[PDB]
């Protein structure tokens, strides 16, 4: 029931668990003298899905979604508490600030005006430094090009980020975010993890049977494009090109290049523009520009 | 041979087998690089980066056959690809 | 004298100074005096470190117990006072800011590339009236403000009339405001990352303590409101590098071992990054104590690897290019600031790399505007500009490493080297060492280069010779220890130097394989290379062994053309 309540109502199940964690942190420590957060991992079942299939259903429920990030905004500090000083008497005052991104449930909106005046009416100053600052980030993530049905458009979503995890995001890397699909539509990302044909046991027997014959390479190079006459050694190099290298990483030094690069020139009469469609439609993942 | 077979072939070679060098394929590629470093006087410049690309392809062929280490014929087919693409 | 703070208050009452400096060492000693007498300490050093903007407005009234004649500033405690009595002042990076340090006093270390002019920023606006006489004063805090045309005096509240108010530029308190961009240090940045910047807003008497082209340690609060600025196990590591024997050849073959041979070219690169001795006559004339090395070669041998290894081992090494933004990447251009309505100057590649190796890849692919600025820092140490907006003299002590190729890619034996090299006589006449790294195909020597590249591509380890390649920190420490040496030439080496110079000048002063002539700058470079060779041997004197090595070096630098 606790598992089902976490999976269907995290707004009513996540704050008592973090209250228990803060009480356990206070009970486990006996020295004198801040909140504590939580994080999850593991299989989700039907909650783990592609962002293009992410729709208006299961709003309140927590969503695990993987993909590729496109943008990472500038780190921006925000005020959650502002302090001030009264020089007429030398006192100190403070005010707190709340919004819809600090709690999972929506609180009653309190638009607290910044104090430009005292309640008595005296002058005051901005005590910059005793007032805490919490930085936030706004990143965008869309689906991976290998799992998505390539030919369509990618759908991206926005993640609002807290102070804690602001140094673990960069564009160009495969990522898997875990958050809550709140709609004031965005996800409140609490857990980020930075990180295709199925193989049977019958296909492995066929590739193990074709591993020791010394006539395999020529017929595999000839079998990629039957609509193009000739050019056997060029597609031999194209076969060696699309399979790859080794990507050797040296110890305490720079990495070594495993990728190969091919440039093709000649008269514009042949199938150089017809070979790119074949290498785009037959590779594992390919991008043509 | 067909379209859904070579994709599985390429990804199984990419995920399982990593090839390593042998003494039988170092000397023939050393001989080929020192013989071409001919082309500089006749038709094309040969650089140091090309040394790296001359064994990358060998490894390639050695992983096309998915053997655990390289062979002399991989360097021979890389030299044959070089003779076709250079001359 | 006696109570120094009351004496400083007497000095500000004598109207001789306008700056107040408060240290934490006196606070620590007063805390020790109060704690050893059994009294309550009630810690100040753990309270000054957080929210100093409230403390600079709160302790100012305690000193005082609109009419501020002085300016209050702070300075933190050093590490020597931190280890004593057993933090608050650590050297912080801009990548080490974490976001949550907004309001702590921080000491940042870095180079300064962008500075602005001193401008008066108002703090309080004074308004005067002729109807009541009560002059009012409003306080501004942001970048902008609005004019208070409505009267808020104590006499116009109980009145029908609400008469016009005027502003006073004399009774209003101003401040010498200046913005600056601190940049991240070169060896403190991580692997692959770029040195991002940060903004520092200074006010008052600290406004002229920041001249661009230097390394600084800035201590201030983080809103950056600076308060104080300053500017600039190991013996076992140097003695175990010395005791192995043949220190010069070991340090030569230790740097860049992923390439084949060329011990002479990279031996002169070792003498190039060790620098030499800067000589001052003390009569208003300074000569260069630097070397500038050319690498002219045909393709096929590696050129960017040696250049990258020199910039990776030596600190403040900046990689440049031939075309692109190079025209603005070698001089200070002008641009509009996106945070405020002012024009700032963008610095080139010669200003963030002040004391170090400045390298140029594809030297013949540049233009005349790049060459006229490269030759100016190649001859002497100051940048001179004459365009509209800035007319200053920029100090720069850099070592020029250049990599070039001929007119037709490779060399030509039927062509003269003055016709093979497209650079003019004044450029290579200033160049003391030019390396004709020419490749010649052979039967025996090419196999070793092939064996070496297959050995380094087989695995990351070096060949099994009876020598171990030294890590970057040890020879970096050796270069920093050898740089403080000041060698003095003798008379027995003087009589060899003048005879070799006379013979070289007579031999130089006109055929098919000839190039250039003997200049006194080459003699000065020979003297500088002999000083660098004596500095590498950590000697106080220059022996006869350095000049005979330097002449052999400069003659074998051109001896490869006969092959």
Swiss-Prot record, chain B:
Subcellular location: Nucleus
Highest rank taxon of the organism: Eukaryota
Coiled coil: none
Role played: Acts as a component of the MCM2-7 complex (MCM complex) which is the putative replicative helicase essential for 'once per cell cycle' DNA replication initiation and elongation in eukaryotic cells. The active ATPase sites in the MCM2-7 ring are formed through the interaction surfaces of two neighboring subunits such that a critical structure of a conserved arginine finger motif is provided in trans relative to the ATP-binding site of the Walker A box of the adjacent subunit. The six ATPase active sites, however, are likely to contribute differentially to the complex helicase activity.
Quaternary assembly: Component of the MCM2-7 complex. The complex forms a toroidal hexameric ring with the proposed subunit order MCM2-MCM6-MCM4-MCM7-MCM3-MCM5; loaded onto DNA, forms a head-head double hexamer. Interacts with CSM1.
Record-stated family: Belongs to the MCM family.
Extra information: Present with 35100 molecules/cell in log phase SD medium.
Protein name: DNA replication licensing factor MCM3
Lineage: Eukaryota, Fungi, Dikarya, Ascomycota, Saccharomycotina
Protein encoded by which gene: MCM3
Full-protein residues shown: 651 to 738 of 971
From Swiss-Prot, chain C:
Source domain of life: Eukaryota
Binding-site positions, ATP 2: 430, 521
Keywords: ATP-binding, Cell cycle, Cytoplasm, DNA replication, DNA-binding, Helicase, Hydrolase, Nucleotide-binding, Nucleus, Phosphoprotein
Locations listed in the record: Cytoplasm; Nucleus
Binding site for ATP 1: 260, 300, 302-304, 405
Assigned EC number: 3.6.4.12
Gene transcribed to yield this protein: MCM7
GO terms of biological process kind: DNA replication; DNA replication initiation; DNA strand elongation involved in DNA replication; double-strand break repair via break-induced replication; nuclear DNA replication; pre-replicative complex assembly involved in nuclear cell cycle DNA replication; premeiotic DNA replication; silent mating-type cassette heterochromatin formation
Further information: Present with 166 molecules/cell in log phase SD medium.
GO cellular component: chromosome, telomeric region; CMG complex; cytoplasm; DNA replication preinitiation complex; MCM complex; MCM core complex; nuclear pre-replicative complex; nuclear replication fork
The protein, known as: DNA replication licensing factor MCM7
Species this protein is from: Saccharomyces cerevisiae (strain ATCC 204508 / S288c) (Baker's yeast)
Family: Belongs to the MCM family.
Flavoprotein found in the keyword field: no
Record domain MCM: where: 247-454
């Amino acid at each position: 029931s606790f598992w089902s309540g976490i999976l269907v109502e995290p707004a009513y199940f996540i704050p008592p668990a973090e209250k228990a964690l803060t009480d356990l942190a206070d009970s486990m420590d006996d020295v004198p003298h801040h909140p504590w957060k939580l994080s999850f991992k593991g299989s989700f079942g039907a909650h783990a899905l592609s962002p293009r299939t992410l729709t208006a259903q299961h709003l309140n429920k927590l969503v695990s979604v993987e993909g590729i990030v496109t943008k990472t905004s500038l780190v921006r500090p925000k005020l959650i508490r502002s302090v001030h000083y009264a020089a007429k008497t030398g006192r100190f005052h403070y005010r707190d600030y709340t919004d819809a991104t600090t709690t999972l449930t929506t609180r009653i909106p309190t638009p607290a005006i910044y104090p430009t005046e005292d309640t008595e009416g005296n002058k005051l100053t901005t005590e910059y430094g005793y007032s805490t600052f919490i930085d936030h980030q706004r990143i965008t993530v869309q689906e991976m090009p290998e799992m998505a049905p390539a030919g369509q458009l990618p759908r991206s979503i926005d993640v609002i980020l807290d102070d804690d995890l602001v140094d673990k995001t960069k564009p160009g890397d495969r990522v898997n975010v875990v958050g809550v699909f709140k709609s004031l539509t965005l996800i409140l990302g609490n857990t980020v993890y930075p990180l295709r044909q199925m193989l049977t046991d019958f296909d492995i027997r066929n590739i193990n049977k074709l591993s020791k014959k010394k006539d395999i390479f020529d017929i595999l190079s000839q079998s990629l494009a039957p609509s193009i006459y000739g050019h056997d050694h060029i597609k031999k190099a194209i076969l060696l090109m699309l399979m790859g290298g080794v990507e050797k990483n040296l110890e305490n030094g720079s990495h070594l290049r495993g990728d190969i690069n091919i440039l093709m020139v000649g008269d514009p009469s042949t199938a150089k523009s017809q070979l790119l469609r074949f290498v785009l439609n037959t590779a594992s993942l390919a991008i043509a520009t | 041979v067909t379209i859904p077979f070579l994709r599985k072939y390429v990804q199984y070679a990419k995920e399982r087998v990593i090839p390593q060098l042998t003494q039988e394929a170092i000397n023939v590629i050393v001989k080929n690089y020192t013989d071409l470093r001919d082309d500089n006087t006749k038709k094309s410049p040969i650089t140091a980066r090309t040394l790296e690309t001359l064994i990358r392809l060998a490894t390639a062929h050695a992983k096309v056959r998915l053997s655990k280490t390289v062979n002399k014929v991989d360097a021979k087919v890389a030299a044959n690809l070089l003779r076709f693409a250079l001359l | 004298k006696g109570p120094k703070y009351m004496a400083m208050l007497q000095k500000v009452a004598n109207r001789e100074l306008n700056s107040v400096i408060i240290d934490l060492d006196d606070i620590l000693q007063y805390q020790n005096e109060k704690f050893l007498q059994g009294t309550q300490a009630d810690d100040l050093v753990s309270a000054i470190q957080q929210n100093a903007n409230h403390f600079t407005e709160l302790f100012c009234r305690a000193i005082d117990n609109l009419t501020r004649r002085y300016f209050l500033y702070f300075k933190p405690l050093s590490q020597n006072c931190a280890r004593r009595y057993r933090i608050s002042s650590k050297p912080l990076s801009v990548r080490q800011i974490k976001g949550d340090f907004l309001g702590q006093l921080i000491t940042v270390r870095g180079i300064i590339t962008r500075v602005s002019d001193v401008k008066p920023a108002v703090e309080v606006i004074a308004y005067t009236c002729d109807q009541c006489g009560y002059e009012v004063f409003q306080e501004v805090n942001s970048r902008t403000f609005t004019p208070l045309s409505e009267c808020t005096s104590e006499e116009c509240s109980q009145n029908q009339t609400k008469g016009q108010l005027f502003m006073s530029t004399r009774a209003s308190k101003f401040s010498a405001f200046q913005e600056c961009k601190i940049q991240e240090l070169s060896q403190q940045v991580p692997v692959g990352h770029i040195p991002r910047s940060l903004n520092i807003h200074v006010n008052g008497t600290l406004v002229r303590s920041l001249s661009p082209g230097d390394i600084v340690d800035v201590t201030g609060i983080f809103l950056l409101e600076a308060q104080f600025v300053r500017q600039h196990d190991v013996e076992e590591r140097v003695m175990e590098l010395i005791t192995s024997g043949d220190v010069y050849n070991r340090l030569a073959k230790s740097i860049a071992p992923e390439i084949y041979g060329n011990l002479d070219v990279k031996k002169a690169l070792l003498l190039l990054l060790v620098g030499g001795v800067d000589k001052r006559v003390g009569d208003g004339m300074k000569i260069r104590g630097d070397i500038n090395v050319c690498l002219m070669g045909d393709p096929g041998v590696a050129k960017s690897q040696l250049l990258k290894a020199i910039c990776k081992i030596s600190p403040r090494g900046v990689y440049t290019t031939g075309k692109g933004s190079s025209g603005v990447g070698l001089t200070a251009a002008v641009m509009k600031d996106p945070v405020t309505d002012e024009m700032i100057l963008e610095g080139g590649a010669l200003v963030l790399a002040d004391n170090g190796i400045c390298c140029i890849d594809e030297f013949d692919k540049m233009d005349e505007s790049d060459r006229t600025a490269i030759h100016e820092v190649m001859e002497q140490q100051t940048i001179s500009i004459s365009k509209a907006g800035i007319n200053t003299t920029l100090n720069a002590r850099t070592s020029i490493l250049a990599a070039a190729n001929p007119l037709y890619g490779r060399y030509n034996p039927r062509l003269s080297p003055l016709d093979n090299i497209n650079l003019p006589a004044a450029l290579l006449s200033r160049f003391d060492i030019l390396f004709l790294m020419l490749d010649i195909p052979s039967r025996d020597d090419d196999e070793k280069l092939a064996e070496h590249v297959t050995y380094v591509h087989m695995h990351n380890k070096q060949p099994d010779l009876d020598f171990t390649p030294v890590e970057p920190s040890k020879m970096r420490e050796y270069i920093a220890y050898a740089k403080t040496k000041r060698p003095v030439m003798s008379e027995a080496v003087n009589d060899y130097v003048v005879q070799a110079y006379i013979r070289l000048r007579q031999d130089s002063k006109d055929s098919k394989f000839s190039f250039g002539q003997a200049t006194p700058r080459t003699l000065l470079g020979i003297i500088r290379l002999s000083q660098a060779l004596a500095k590498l041997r950590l000697a106080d004197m220059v022996d006869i062994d350095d000049v005979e090595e330097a002449l052999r070096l400069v003659r074998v630098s051109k001896e490869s053309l006969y092959q």
